[PDB]
Design a protein around this ligand. Structure first.
Ligand SMILES: [Cl-]
Ligand SMILES: [Cl-]
Lengths: 99, 99
């Protein structure tokens, strides 16, 4: 699709069999998703502030569907106030900025 | 242009006769630029944290050139660690996300 920027680029994603709303965020390196159940192994990471503040679970090789386009990548799962789709997944779906 | 997302979308902007590096950030509603001189009237605003923490100067009707495209809009000027081009200016240059 082509997504205009007059409103926040919030889209429906499908991840772990669940539908969620997420922000397509070219300013974010990484993808962070609210607490949820995901299968497979994960490793603990520390994010936010100076050198980590909040504990999240890093899941690799997670498939996320974004407007009918599947992306595969690393997702950090924890108590984030907003689900963020960052560049690590935007590149996977071939997303570009255009003007 | 078409800007890919393999690297942070940092671009050169021209604002107030000066060249700066700025992040094209679809996750940001507004545009914030590091301390600099700009002509005309401004009004004080409070941004960051809960209900404002850092004082900035709001300048309206500022022209910013982004990759050969002029945008006109409101710019908040203050001690930000990164220059951010937010949706208020991205829409002005006709920037869209595409996949
Ligand atoms: Cl499509
Ligand atoms: Cl062009």
């Amino acid at each position: 699709p082509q997504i205009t920027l007059w409103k926040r680029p919030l889209v429906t994603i499908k991840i772990g069999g669940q539908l969620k709303e997420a922000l397509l965020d070219t300013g974010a390196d990484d993808t962070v998703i609210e607490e949820m159940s995901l299968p497979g192994r994960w490793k603990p990471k520390m994010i936010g502030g100076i050198g980590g503040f909040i504990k999240v679970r890093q899941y690799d090789q997670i498939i996320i569907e974004i407007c009918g386009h599947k992306a595969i990548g690393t997702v950090l799962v924890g108590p984030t106030p907003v689900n963020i789709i960052g560049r690590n997944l935007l590149t996977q779906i071939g997303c570009t900025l255009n003007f």
